[PDB]
Design a protein around this ligand. Sequence first.
Ligand SMILES: [Mg+2]
Ligand SMILES: [Zn+2]
Ligand SMILES: [Zn+2]
Ligand SMILES: [Zn+2]
Lengths: 76, 285, 44, 100, 42, 339, 62, 41, 474
Amino acid sequence: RKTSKFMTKYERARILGTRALQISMNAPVMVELEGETDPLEIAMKELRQRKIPFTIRRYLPDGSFEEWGVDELIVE
Amino acid sequence: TYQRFPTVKIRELKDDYAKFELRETDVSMANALRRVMISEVPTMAIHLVKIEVNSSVLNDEFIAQRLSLIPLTSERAMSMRFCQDCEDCNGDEHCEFCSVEFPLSAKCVTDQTLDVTSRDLYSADPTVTPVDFHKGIIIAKLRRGQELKLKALARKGIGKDHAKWSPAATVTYMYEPDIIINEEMMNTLTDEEKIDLIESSPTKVFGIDPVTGQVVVVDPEAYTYDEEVIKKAEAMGKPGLIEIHPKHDSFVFTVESTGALKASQLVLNAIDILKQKLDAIRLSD
Amino acid sequence: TYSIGQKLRIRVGPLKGYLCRVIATVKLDSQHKIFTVKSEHLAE
Amino acid sequence: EGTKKVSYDRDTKIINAASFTVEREDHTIGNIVRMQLHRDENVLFAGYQLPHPLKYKIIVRIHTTSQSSPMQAYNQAINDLDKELDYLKNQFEAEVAKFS
Amino acid sequence: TYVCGDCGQENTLKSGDVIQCRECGYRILYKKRTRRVVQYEA
Amino acid sequence: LKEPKIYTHCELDLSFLLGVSCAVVPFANHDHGRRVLYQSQKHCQQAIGFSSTNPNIRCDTLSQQLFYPQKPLFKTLASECLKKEVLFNGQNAIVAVNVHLGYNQEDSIVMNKASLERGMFRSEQIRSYKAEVDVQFGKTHVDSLEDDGFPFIGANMSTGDIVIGRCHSIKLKHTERGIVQKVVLSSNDEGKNFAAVSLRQVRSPCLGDKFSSMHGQKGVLGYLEEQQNFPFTIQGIVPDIVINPHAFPSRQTPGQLLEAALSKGIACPIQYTKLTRHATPFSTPGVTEITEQLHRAGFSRWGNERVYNGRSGEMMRSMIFMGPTFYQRLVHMSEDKVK
Amino acid sequence: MIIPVRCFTCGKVIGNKWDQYLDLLQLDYTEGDALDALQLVRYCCRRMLMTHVDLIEKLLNY
Amino acid sequence: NLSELGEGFLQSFCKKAATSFFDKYGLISHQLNSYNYFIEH
Amino acid sequence: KGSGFSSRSVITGDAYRHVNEVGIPIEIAQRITFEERVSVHNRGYLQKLVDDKLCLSYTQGSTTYSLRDGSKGHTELKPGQVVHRRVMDGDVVFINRPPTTHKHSLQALRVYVHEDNTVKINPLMCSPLSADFDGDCVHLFYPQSLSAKAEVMELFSVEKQLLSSHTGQLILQMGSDSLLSLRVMLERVFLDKATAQQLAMYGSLSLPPPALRKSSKSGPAWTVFQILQLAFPERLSCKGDRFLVDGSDLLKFDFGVDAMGSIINEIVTSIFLEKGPKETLGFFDSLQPLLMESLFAEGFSLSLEDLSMSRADMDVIHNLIIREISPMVSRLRLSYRDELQLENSIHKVKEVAANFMLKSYSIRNLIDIKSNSAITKLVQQTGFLGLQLSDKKKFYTKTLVEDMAIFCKRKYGRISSSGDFGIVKGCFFHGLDPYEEMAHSIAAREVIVRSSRGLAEPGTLFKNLMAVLRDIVI
RNA sequence: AUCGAGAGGU
Ligand SMILES: [Mg+2]
Ligand SMILES: [Zn+2]
Ligand SMILES: [Zn+2]
Ligand SMILES: [Zn+2]
C-alpha cells in the first residue's frame, strides 16, 4: 500500500505517549535499561530500538484499512 | 618565584581624601583594590528601626530609610561579628559583639519648627556614634504637638548587600599619561595653528611657551583620555604630531570616604581583607 | 509552648531579631512573608 | 552549605589541564588570579568564567606544561599574590607615617 | 477612641450612633494611633 | 525686528501654541510626531510623582507618591512662567547609552542596584478599601480587628484578612496587602454609615517595571547590577541607567541625546552666568551652542567620555555617551500583572 | 521630601548641606558659584541639589 | 522706531507678560467663568 | 470558554542560558503543579519528594486528599493514587502570544527556577514570536496529561520547528547585539593573549594551535576565525562557494557590508541539514554569550559627532532641493506618472544623503544598508525630511491641501512658495518650523488611522479565510 | 453576586 514506508511525526508522538503511559502503569520494560527518573527517557530508549510490542493500523479514505508492522518500518 | 613588587608614594592625605600613586603593578591589582573598597570593607549602620510615636508628616518608612543611610563612625567594624554569626544573643539590644542600640526622641513644644537632626541620636556604646562634620543631617521636621520616639539597632555589614554599609564616596584610578610631541613636525605649524591646537583641548594638558612659542606639555596628569587633541591634528593634516598613550604600570588612585572610616585605614583595611580572601581559596592538597 | 497572637523574636537565621506575631507560622510586623519555624528558633 | 569553597576536577582529554570551582567568589578574585597565572612560564591557558551571571561562583581553568601540574601553579599564584600584598601594606604604612 | 475631623475631640464610639462629633456635630471621625511598637527594617 | 513695517502683530512665544503637557517638553520639535504624541498623552499621565499636599483628607482608591521627587535641570519657558512645579514628575538619572551584556536589548532597561537602594525611584502606594452600612460595623463575636470591626492603625494586613468587618465582611483579595495608615468613618443625612480603611505599601523598582523618558522611549527593567560591575569614568561616576545604542536610530528621537548634553553642561563645574539653560520647544539652544558649553566645562565637545571597564580595569576602546536625563516611572507595576 | 541624605550615584553625603545652599543663594551667588563653595565637584552630586523641590514646608502647613 | 528698544527688552517683556496672564486668568478660567454666569445672569 | 491552567506576567531578556530554558517565578511555580502517574522506575524519587512536603495534594480514586499540616501518618505510595508534583527543572510548557498568524510563536521550553517575579525570554526567540521587551504579556500554559506531555515535548519543541513553513529558512534570525558584536569583532582580525583566552572560556573546547606564533613585538596571537571554529560543531562540511570547513576548521570567511548575515545564515542552514537541530542549538548557546562578552569589553555608543551635519554637504543638499523643487509645480495637476517619477527622484536624493551620512563609524555598524525603511528613518532624522503631503490618501479631505496649506504659506512665508508641501527643509536634529510640525502631525495622524484600519479589517479578512480552510488535510 | 459604561497595556 505505502511505498515510502516513512513514519510520520504525529504517529511517533502518539506511540511515545502511549508507551510512556503504559510504562507508567506498573509495568516492566521490555529492554534492560531500568533506573531512569522520568518515563520519557524510558519511552525514548524503547522506541530507539526495533522491538515494539504494538503496531499502527492505517486507514484508507476509500473505506478500508491496511496493516503495517513497526518491525519492517524504519524510524529516522 | 613570580611576584610583583608594587611601590606607593602618597601625595595628599587628610581624613577623608588620599591620593596615592601606585607604580609597578598591573591594573588588575588596582581594580581589585577599588572593587573591594567599594563593596567589602565593612562598616556599621542602622538596620532595624522600631518606632513608637510618629506624628509627623512623613511616614514611617521614610524615616527608617533616612535613618539608615546616616554615616556612623565604625572603627570597630572589622572586629565585630556579622550578626548572623553571633550566637551570644537573640539579636536584640546591645551585644558587645554584634549590635549597638540608638534611642532618639523628640516633640516640638514651641512654635518655630524643630529639626530632628542627627545630633539627637544618642547611643549606648560610646564608640559607634554618628559621624560629626555644621549641623547634621535632618531626619524630619516637626511642628507643634508632633512627636517621634524610636529605638534603633545598628549592625555590621558589607556594601554588597545594601549601600548603607559602604564606606566610599568614590574610589578611582587613572592610568598616568605618557605624552610625546614630534617637536619638529611641531615646528612646521604656524603660530595660529598652534593656538588652535592648544585650545581644542578640553582640559588643559598642553600650553604654549612664553618664549619659543612651542607647545609644551605643562600638566600630564590632566588628560582624560579623550581623543581630541589627536583628532584635531589628523584633520589639520600633520598626523602624529602628538601621540599620547597610557603608561601601564603607573596609576594614581584617589580615595575619599564617607567619614565612617578614615581614608588611610580604608586602604589598609582593604589589603587586609583581600589577603583573607585569598587565603581561603588555597586548595591545600 | 506558646499561644495564638503572641509576639516572638526570630533568634537565629537570616531574619534575626525580627519581631513577628504567630498567626497560627509567624508573620512579620511590616513585611509580607509568612514563615514557619520551630520553637527553638523563637523567643519572647 | 559547607560544600568546599574550592573544588578540583581534572580534564580527561587534555593532559595537564584542570578546572577549579571556587564558590562564593567573583570577578575580584578571578581577575587577580588570572593575571598572575599568566606571569608564569609553565602555564599555557588560564581564564575564569561565571557560570551564570547571577550566581556567585567562578570556574577557573588552567593548562600547563609538563614541568608543572595545574594544582601547583594555582597554589603558587595565590601564594605569590599574598606576598605582594604584604609588600604593599608595608609600603603604605611606611608612607602614612611619613606624612604625619 | 476616634478623633473628630474638624476640631480635636475624642470619644469612644457606640455601635449604631450616627457618627457625629458629639460636641460639634460634623460627621467625620478618624481612628487614633495607640502606642504599640512597630519594627520596620530599614 | 528685522522688518518692522510689514507686520501688525507679534506672537508672544511660539512655545505657547502647544498644550500644558506639551509646551514643557524639551526639544519637542526635535522628535517624531507619534513619539511626542505618546509622551504627551500617556507617559505624562502615567508618570508617578508629587501626589498631594494634604493627604489625610483624601481617600482615593490608589495614590502613589515619590519619596524624593525632583525638578528637571533644563528650563522650558512655559514652566518658568507658570511657576508651578507639579508639571514634571520624575527624577534626573545619569544615563550612558551602551550595550550591557545583552540584557538591554530590545528596549529593556538595566539599572544600578545601588542607586535604587540609596533611594531613587521609590514610591508609596496607598489604596483604600470601602464599605457602607445602613449589618452593623462590628466584630463577629481575623485577629487584627478591634472591638469595632476596624483594624488597628499600624497593623500589617495580609492577602486573606478581614479589613472591614460587618456583623458578611470584606476580605482582602490577592494583590492587597499593607500597613493600615488611616481609618475614617462618616455618615450622610440619609442615615447611612460609611467607613474606609487605607493600606500603604512601599515599593522599589523591581524587574518588570516600565520606565519612560520625556521624549518617548519606553522600557522594562530587565537587570539590576551592582555598582562595581558597571563601567566607570575617570571621575568615578557610574551610570545609573544604561540603554541600548540601537534604540536611538530606529526611533526618531534625536532629542534625548540633545537634552542630555545640555544638562550635563548645566551641571558641570566650570573653571558662570552665560550658561544656557533653556530648551523651549520652538526656540531650542543650538547644537553649536550646546557643544561649546560642554567644551568649556571640560568634557568632550560631542558628549562622550572614556570609560574603564569595571570587571577588568582596562580602558575600553569606544567612548560612551553619558549625561543626565529626566526619567519617569509608570503606574503599571510588574507585581499586579503576575497572576 | 527633604534633601536626600546621600547622592544617588556616588554615595556622597549631601544631606547636610541644603541649608547652606539656600543661604548662600540668598546672598548673591549664582547657583554654581555656590555649589562650588559647598565643595561639590562631580556632576552627579551637583544635580541632586540644583534639582530638588522642597515640599516639606508645605506639607507642614496643611 | 522700534529700534531703540532692543531685542532683549522685548523678550524680557514677553515673559514678564505671560506670567501676568497666568496670574489674571489662570489655567481653568474657562470653566469657572461659565458657571459663574449660569448662576448669575 | 475558560481554561484551567494559566499564567501571565511581564517577560524580560536572558541571553546567558540555553534557548529551551525559560524562567518561572516562585509563587507561580508554587501554585501550579504537574500531574504524573506513579511508576515503578521512580518509586524512591516520589517518596523522597513527598516526605519533604513539596507537593500540594494527591487524588485517590474519586476523592482528593490534601498534603497540608495535620497528617500524622506516612503517605504510603500506591499506583492508583495519583499525585501532582511541583514544577521543577525538567518540565515542559508551551506559551501563547498576542494573536499572530505564525504558529511558530507557540513553542515548548523547559522551565527554570529563580527568585524574581518576571519571566526570562532570550532575545533569540524574538523572531519566532512578536513580543518586544516593552511591556508585552504572554499566556504560559501547563500540560496536565502525560499524552499531552509527549505531544508538547515532541511537536512544540524547538528541535522540530526550525524549518519554517512560511519562508523556508531558519526562524532563528540574527539579533541586533549579535550582529553588532560580530561586526566589531571582525573589524579587529587579531586579538591579544589574555583577551583571546578569556573569550574561549565561554567556548566548548580548548585552542591548542595559535594563529600568529612569533612576531616583532607580539608573541602568541590568535584570531577570531579560530574562536568561531571552537564555537562551531565538531565535524562539518558546508561548501557554500564562499566558506570551507573540515572538522571545526574554517578556511576562508569573506567580509562585506551586509553579506555576513547571509553567510552565517547559509552556515547555520548547512549545519542544521547536515547533523541536526541539537547541534545548531548548542552552537547558538555557545556563540551568544561569547559574542556578548566580546562586545562588552569594547563598548558601543553613539555620540553627537555621529549626527554631523557637514555644513558643506548641507549646502549641497539645499542646492539639490532647490533644483528638485522645480517639478513640484506640475505634480498634483498632470497625472500620477509624474508622482512616481517624483518618488524615484526623492529615493535617489535619499540614497545620496545616506551615502553622505554613512561615513561615520557607529551609524554604518548599527544601521542596515540594503533596507529602505532604515534608510528612510535615518535620513528623516538627520536632514531633508521626506514628503509628507500627498493626494493618494483618501483618509483625509482634499480641502486640507487645496485651500489650507497655500493660505498658511502665504500668511506665514514672505515669498509665494506654492510648491512647499512636502519639500520641508528642516530636520529632526535641527529646529522644526511650526508649519513643518503641523504637516508632520497631520502625516502622523494619517499613519495612525491607517494603522488602526490595517489592524481592524485584516482581522475580519483572516476570520473569513479561516472559517473555510479548517478541513484540508492530506 | 449580576449588568452596563468609561479609562487602559498589547
Ligand atoms: Mg510591544
Ligand atoms: Zn550578638
Ligand atoms: Zn468636633
Ligand atoms: Zn555623587
